[PDB]
Amino acid sequence: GVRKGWHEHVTQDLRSHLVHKLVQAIFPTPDPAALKDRRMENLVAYAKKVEGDMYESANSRDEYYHLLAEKIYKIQKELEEKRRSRL
Amino acid sequence: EDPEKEKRIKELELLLMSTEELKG
């Protein structure tokens, strides 16, 4: 739905922790020398753009979480299809 | 098509909502 000014109740700290969740959900890893790699930094950069786009597309905080969850799901399925086609 | 798509999406929704762990 539409909640006027819902951005005023979403702090920058929350968005940044949400960006971290998108990364963790797409590529779970206990930093085995991974956060420093270029390929992981490109993921963080793509995750910020996904969060940025859904932050403006959504019109309430419930839409925000909904669209993000559906975008993560679609990215996981894509990663999982490419991982299979390589077996 | 994917029979668990609805299940996985709801699991992801909860994952994100639980971030609000910053002050709980």
């Binding site: 797409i26 590529f27 085995p32 991974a34 790699d37 270029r38 390929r39 992981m40 490109n42 993921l43 793509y46 990215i75 894509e78 990663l79 490419k82 991982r83 390589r86 | -």
Partner: protein, 54 residues
């Protein structure tokens, strides 16, 4: 009436076709750039897993 020679209004339909053509190609172009970024990111993650196979 001299409206017997009224020329046909053929210009609007033709402009509409071009407009939708150009809109679709710009739409396509943006979508292609984004789906290529995603491929590169995911290709980069798959090659990150393959390294950690031991």
């Amino acid at each position: 009436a001299s409206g017997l020679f009224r020329a046909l209004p053929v210009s609007a339909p033709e402009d509409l076709l071009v407009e939708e053509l150009v809109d679709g190609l710009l739409s396509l172009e943006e979508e292609l750039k984004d789906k290529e970024e995603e491929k590169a990111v995911l290709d980069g993650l798959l090659s990150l897993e393959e390294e950690s196979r031991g």
